[PDB]
Write a structure and sequence with these properties.
heterohexamer; A mainly alpha; B mainly beta; C mainly beta; A: mainly alpha; 18 helices; 66% helix; globular; C: Immunoglobulin-like; four-stranded antiparallel sheet; elongated; binds chloride ion; chloride:proton antiporter activity (chain A); transmembrane (chain A)
Chain lengths: 441, 221, 211, 444, 221, 211
């Protein structure tokens, strides 16, 4: 007791040195998150001043529409297998591990590796997000300063590491609140009190979001517009949808996991059986991204279109499955890129469909598919990655339909409530555990 | 919050009329607009409903395009097109604004009304005649005046006094039909010391006919 | 689609009395609504979700019911409650309204107020000749008008029209209008209007003479 | 050691079905409660109208019964506390927050009726106390009550059912679920050692109540500022400034609340009647101001919308600020059952607004709208007094709906704590526990 | 998205005119509306600006109420009242829509703008005279015709040829003012083998004067 | 009241050329804006916040500057760039615009075509007598017209008006009009019109005789 009484009176006191550093970090992360996002596009662009140039000879298209996504995809895998095996994949399992001090932060490697690396996988047209990759590029940034300024003390190692992630997650979706709720609901060492200074993170997050706004002002990543509302007599519908996500949540986890094994055999661990398999799936994607783009790429762009109800029940399911595939085959292939972003797209798409069904099922609830396409935009996060609170909020953060908060929760909750009672685990933790156990022994 | 629907009137069987409903006093969007019609004497019957983005539109069990509800949120106006009309379509047409409590939607704010009469008749303006007391007027405490509105078609006519400024002691009997023509009278009792001395005017309006007339009730000179 | 049928089609009770009207559904409904419609006005949302008075509804009113049968009640109804109540459901598409119930107020006697009116000078200037004769504010509604040209019966051309119970004073008013050709009219003098109502044994006459 | 973690990861998010199901029963109960309280409170503030108006002719007769009522009740309040649950008095969160670390008991069979009926009087009278805080506490107890009535044992189910009870409570209060969670896990939560509180458990709880609250409070919000304009990056620094101001005044307001609650102890020494009498004293006082200048009395909620709009003049603002800066202390610091969470928002709003108006005219080229500043600061006096930025920022958004202002709202609340830190001060909620924890001992 | 402002015109010194600006193609609210005027020949000068809820309205250093900007968001229209006008007020008045980038606001989307002449002079139709080449016309490859439009007020006049159907080789010099009267000529060069042989008509219009005349350019006798 | 003053008031350069216009502020500004105004059209937002081309502005255009002095540039200007650019600031209230800069498609010298006309027969039928004399399509704009009645000077009553550089051929055209009284006119014969432009040493005469 006596201790506590002294501990209370000694709260929220975080060293000015730390706070000031979280700021430098946050800042850096931003400028970075930006140039990455900028570069990625720039390429997905060139891959146009390419196709169109050869838009006459069809096979010539479908050809250069493979080679480019192949030449780059490879270049990606290369800069990873030969310079930073820790990059490949999301990048969050690592940072999340590096927090508990079970993995190193080889920033002098990872940074250029993950950066330029994913610049190829993504800038080509693969089914990987760029969010995850940044969370990682983030922490390293935090590390880099820690080292370059040798301010020592757990607190400043777990703090500057965490904020670096947050800042990163933020500038990714222009979503500060998410970047924080995240670090303190997932990344954070899940089983023992820690020396991460919340306030430290904030200053970081902010500093990056500002940095992101400096170059991304006047336009959002998504713009669904104020959707209708939702009466209490249509709440149970979002529970149902939630339970569905709750059963398919762990399943998609098995696949992602196992599929990444069955994808190991093809190369055994050989740099060239990979790099070759790299621009293989890579080129594949770049091709689909000109014969049915909703199966390839980031997947963002099709969320707005999906929420509107522009996709028919047919085109939806197709787009779902197609991606249910391209996604695995791309992430599970250890390519530098995450599955955070693309998971949203799946969610959105799965949700929408559930909507349309509902709409006609009961026309007396005066539904609008659009709302279901949102109670689930982040539900496949509340089952795969089991970070509801971070999702719910990341959605709101960039969907702006707080009127749907009651549904959005009842879904995501119903999600983990089944992703639990039916096996499954934090697809992000499982990865660490595996990549942690495959370490000792 | 005003829901004012125009358009109604006289149409010959197998015809088509575009009823309009202008909204004001609230945000047209976020709102599900609908129509419900009341057949003279009978009850109400829901016609249709058209969500905000007009990405949804339903009607009662009625064939193909008897009805065609639409809306131009740019003009906060609700529309209704009835084609191949028949006598069963003669009623009062209201446009409501839709909302809900627990979720089982209700008709929130019903507009005024607009009437559609299906008939081969002719839109006939009305004649307004002043009903002043006789010469043997036993001018007591109160004086009953009134004006007669007859020979018009179709319904309805609106009778107010001194422009509504005189609302207490007013009457307007239901119109009686006869020989494809309507006829009603309006009563208005005022204090005797208040009438001859002042101006008692009766203002009749017949939308269909597109006419308005103000008859000045003057003593029987 | 659901068939809502409101029980009393028409009913009357004296203010300060407790009145209750039913509304049964063919099948099963929930969270019924009620609209009040007074003469001359579009419906007004009264009670909803079975028993939520709307902002403004006197706490005099109360909603109730469940699944198959619902009701609406007025503890001590007031005269300003005279109107037609419509229960409606939308717990099953497409929505559906009831047959309605017409509330009528019972009040004490209240003898007419006749008024005879000589064909306007302007109407005469077109062959028409309408002899209007009002009967304002009486109760009950049972009242008999009878015309007498130059002291004689007459029923041809006569047209009557009652108004609906007044929302405030709860009295009725009815107009009787005899129509004739300028000539048919001009060839007579005495035009009497006789009104017979409960409030009296000897009818109320009110005539005027062209002479 | 990595041998364990690898097993701990693969064993995550597994919360006993028995717990989850209970957090539900709890969350539910909390709601129904939070409702009836809120309902009862109004019902009285109502009667206190069918009183004044009845005697609205004889002025002194008004000002009279406009004191007696808020006095007779306020007293009744203090009474039901000093004689049945000393733990109730004051916010009630310092306790729940302590009862988490197991440093205070949860005498629910006492607190519940006490805090309930008690604050029903203090609040239902017109005092400058919120009803949120009081609920957070009423909540946890609810959680406890079930824990005891079902004797499901195990730290997890004692810290969990206790925490969710709080959250549920906080939520049903502002009809804000997200806040009710972010809160428990940014403040209430034992601040220095890993704990057995099942996040997911809370959620189900929070939800269950928000639903319960929506069942009786639909179609109408507690606030409705409407979409305000936006904020250009070149006007960002302005919210930092406002933040810093909150940051210096944050700890100060804390000294006062604290000390003032001491200087208010002398008047009664600890005597039930020197209190109860001083109770209906400030109580009656309030009820009076609540009919001569209400913006100085009561919850304060109602004046937030009015404030944000810009309907109060720079004069009327400052006056309302100060007046409340006083009625608030004098009411909370007086150990009356009621919190300072809600009323703190009011001060925030009011202080922010003013800052706006100054700004507006200062630079008309930023095309400002005071309303935004009245929002970057609605919860800033929370990010300094109670130092729970994240919970505020989100509680605000939760019920102000202007996410377009998220960048500013943060930069303020951050700047808030960034000065509430570099200048003394501490979690006004923690300090209270510490004191009431140290005074527990150091007295034997 | 369109910004169309009417109202401008002719006003006598010491007068008052209500300029109107109708907006369409975007949400009027959320938008700060303003006016800026360009004096013939000179540059632009900002007049005022009025925020959405019209809870703010600023003008340039101008006295009391020379200007009175307001807006009716119910009609998505921006207004401007100028009182006690003087020659300095004669210019083209534009209403812009206001936005910003980093935050240092800019005039986003402009409109054609209405012209406002402030004079004593009286309006006045124009006289149109055909400018055919002399009798000693050295009829070469190309032949230059043209018609003179003089003695009119106020601006402007519109001169086209053969109804626009002849747009290549056309000229319309700026009008010169003199003695409260305007005067301009229009040039139109065409192929000699194309003129005498065909019909070269010059069509002048003076909206204010409410006149239209077509002068047929015929060879000099 | 920042006094923005755009440097070149008027300037000409042949397309594909690199052109740059200045815009100095009396005090200190930041994030200047630029508006393009082609003849007959309201201003158009070109560049903003010192250098953000607006959706549509050819990447040919570039903004720049800082605090006290800013500039706008065109790497290889095209003909469709002929217009008047207006820099404006609002980094200090109240906003202010610059004096503007007029860009003009500098072209090769063009000898002016001179066409003189006798006063219409119709105008003479009203005491008026206007002797119009055109000067079509020349460059540069510097040109001097001079009238000679019966072989003699004359400057009274003469009115000139130049057109604005043509959007297409980038040439100028200016009209000179000598006005007289039907009588003043009739009492003379020779009416010459002399034009002096760079394109020649010996002026271009063009007269007609009433006789
Ligand atoms: Cl991974
Ligand atoms: Cl990602
Ligand atoms: Cl990821
Ligand atoms: Cl307390
Ligand atoms: Cl509170
Ligand atoms: Cl509190």
């Amino acid at each position: 007791r006596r201790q506590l009484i002294r501990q209370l009176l000694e709260r929220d006191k975080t060293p000015l040195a730390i706070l000031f550093m979280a700021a430098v970090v946050g800042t850096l992360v931003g400028l970075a998150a930006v140039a990455f996002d900028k570069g990625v596009a720039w390429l997905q662009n060139q891959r146009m001043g390419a196709l169109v140039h050869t838009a006459d000879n069809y096979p010539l298209l479908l050809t250069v529409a493979f080679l480019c996504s192949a030449v780059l995809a490879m270049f990606g895998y290369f800069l990873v297998r030969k310079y930073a095996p820790e990059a490949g994949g999301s990048g969050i399992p690592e940072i999340e591990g590096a927090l508990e001090d079970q993995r190193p932060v080889r920033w002098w490697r990872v940074l250029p590796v993950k950066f330029f690396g994913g610049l190829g996988t993504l800038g080509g047209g693969m089914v990987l997000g760029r969010q995850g990759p940044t969370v990682q590029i983030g922490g390293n940034i935090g590390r880099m300063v820690l080292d370059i300024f040798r301010l020592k003390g757990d607190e400043a190692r777990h703090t500057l590491l965490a904020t670096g992630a947050a800042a990163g997650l933020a500038a990714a979706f222009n979503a500060p609140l998410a970047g924080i709720l995240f670090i303190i609901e997932e990344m954070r060492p899940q089983f023992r009190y820690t020396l991460i200074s919340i306030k430290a993170v904030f200053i970081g997050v902010i500093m990056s979001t500002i940095m992101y706004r400096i170059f991304n002002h006047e336009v959002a990543l998504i713009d669904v517009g104020k959707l209708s509302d939702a009466p209490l007599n249509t709440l149970w519908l979002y529970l149902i949808l939630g339970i569905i996500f709750g059963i398919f949540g762990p399943i998609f986890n098995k696949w992602v996991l196992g599929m990444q094994d069955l994808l190991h055999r093809v190369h055994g661990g050989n740099i060239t059986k990979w790099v070759l398999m790299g621009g293989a799936i890579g080129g594949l994607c770049g091709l689909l991204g000109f014969v049915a783009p909703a199966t390839s790429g980031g997947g963002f762009n099709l969320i707005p279109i999906a929420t509107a109800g522009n996709f028919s029940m047919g085109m939806l399911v197709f787009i779902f499955v197609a991606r249910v595939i391209t996604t695995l085959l791309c992430f599970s292939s250890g390519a530098p890129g995450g599955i955070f972003a693309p998971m949203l797209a799946l969610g959105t798409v799965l949700g929408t469909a559930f909507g349309m069904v509902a709409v006609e099922l009961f026309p007396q609830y005066h539904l609008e598919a659009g709302t279901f396409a949102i109670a689930g935009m982040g539900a496949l996060l509340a089952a795969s990655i089991r970070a509801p609170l971070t999702g719910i909020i990341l959605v709101l953060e960039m969907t702006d339909n707080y009127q749907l908060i009651l549904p959005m929760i009842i879904t995501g909750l119903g999600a983990t409530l089944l992703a639990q009672f039916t096996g499954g685990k934090p697809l992000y933790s499982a990865i660490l555990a595996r990549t942690l156990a495959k370490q000792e022994a | 919050v005003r829901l004012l629907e125009s358009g109604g009137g006289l149409v010959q069987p197998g015809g088509s009329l575009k009823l309009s409903c202008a909204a004001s006093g609230f945000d047209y969007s976020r709102y599900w607009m609908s129509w419900v019609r009341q057949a003279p004497g009978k009850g109400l019957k829901w016609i249709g409903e058209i969500n905000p983005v007009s990405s949804t539109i339903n009607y009662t069990p009625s064939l193909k395009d008897k009805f065609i509800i639409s809306r131009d949120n740019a003009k906060d106006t609700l529309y209704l097109q009835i084609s191949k009309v028949r006598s069963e379509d003669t009623a009062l047409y209201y446009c409501a604004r839709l909302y809900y409590g627990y979720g089982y939607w209700y008709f929130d704010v019903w507009g005024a009304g607009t009437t559609v009469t299906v008939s081969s008749a002719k839109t006939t303006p009305p004649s307004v005649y002043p009903l002043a007391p006789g010469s043997a007027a036993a001018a007591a405490s109160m004086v009953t005046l009134g004006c007669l509105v007859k020979g018009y078609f179709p319904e309805p006519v609106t009778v107010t006094w001194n422009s509504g400024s005189l609302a207490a002691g007013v009457h307007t009997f239901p119109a009686v039909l006869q020989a494809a023509l309507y006829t009603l009278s309006s009563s208005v009792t005022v204090p005797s010391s208040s009438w001859p001395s002042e101006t008692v005017t009766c203002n009749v309006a017949h939308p269909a006919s597109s006419t308005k007339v103000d008859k000045k009730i003057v003593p029987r000179a | 689609d659901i068939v809502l049928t409101q029980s009393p089609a028409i009913m009357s009770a004296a203010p300060g009395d407790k009145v209750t009207m039913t509304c049964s559904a063919s099948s099963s409904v929930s969270y019924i609504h009620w609209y009040q419609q007074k003469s001359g006005t579009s419906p007004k949302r009264w009670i909803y979700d079975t028993s939520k008075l709307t902002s403004g509804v006197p706490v005099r009113f109360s909603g109730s019911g469940s699944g198959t049968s619902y009701s609406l009640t007025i503890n001590t109804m007031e005269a300003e409650d005279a109107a037609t109540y419509y229960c409606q459901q939308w717990s099953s598409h497409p929505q559906t309204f009831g047959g309605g119930t017409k509330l009528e107020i019972l009040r004490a006697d209240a003898a007419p107020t006749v008024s005879i009116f000589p064909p306007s000078s302007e109407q005469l200037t077109s062959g028409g000749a309408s002899v209007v004769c009002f009967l304002n504010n009486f109760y009950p509604k049972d009242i008999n008008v009878k015309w007498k040209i130059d002291g004689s019966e007459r029923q041809n051309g006569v047209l009557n029209s009652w108004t609906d119970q007044d929302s405030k004073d709860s009295t009725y008013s009815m107009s009787s209008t005899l129509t004739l050709t300028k000539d048919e009219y001009e060839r007579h003098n005495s035009y009497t209007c006789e009104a017979t109502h409960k409030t009296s044994t000897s009818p109320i006459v009110k005539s005027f003479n062209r002479a």
